[PDB]
Amino acid sequence: CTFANLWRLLAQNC
Amino acid sequence: CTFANLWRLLAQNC
Amino acid sequence: CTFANLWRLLAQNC
Amino acid sequence: CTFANLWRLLAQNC
């Protein structure tokens, strides 16, 4: 549950 | 690319 | 400023 | 449950 994982998902989906 | 989707994908770990 | 905190704050809506 | 609210909370907390 990290900012890193948020950025990863934003990069993958947006 | 919706926040609801990302929030749900992050739910397991958060 | 932690993603865990933001995810929890957004649980109210998501 | 929106990107807009995520950004608001990021601005407030980070």
Numbering used by the authors:
A (entry chain A), B (entry chain B), C (entry chain C), D (entry chain D): 1 to 14
Can you list sentences taken from the study reporting this PDB entry?
Concurrent with alanine scanning and CD analyses, we also determined the three-dimensional structure of the CV1 dimer at 1.0 Å resolution. The asymmetric unit is composed of two interacting dimers. In contrast to the previously proposed dimer interface involving tryptophan residues, the structure of each dimer in the crystal structure reveals a canonical knobs-into-holes packing between Leu6, Leu9, and Leu10 as expected for a dimer of α-helices. The helical portion of each peptide is capped at the N-terminus by Thr2. Cysteine residues extend beyond the helical segment of each peptide to form bridging disulfide bonds. Asn5 and Asn13 form long-range hydrogen bonding interactions within each dimer, which is consistent with the slightly decreased stability of the N5A and N13A dimers relative to CV1 in CD experiments. For each dimer, one of the Phe3 residues and both Trp7 residues are oriented away from the dimer interface, suggesting a limited role for these residues in dimerization/disulfide bond formation. While not contributing to individual dimers, the Phe3 and Trp7 residues appear to stabilize a dimer of dimers in the asymmetric unit and help to rationalize several observations from previous and current CD data. The interface between dimers resembles a hydrophobic protein core and is composed of four copies each of Phe3, Leu6, Trp7, and Leu10. The Trp7 residues form two types of interactions: the Trp7 residues from chains B and C form a parallel displaced stacking arrangement at a distance of approximately 3.2 Å (left) while the Trp7 residues from chains A and D are parallel to each other but interacting with other hydrophobic core residues instead of each other (right).
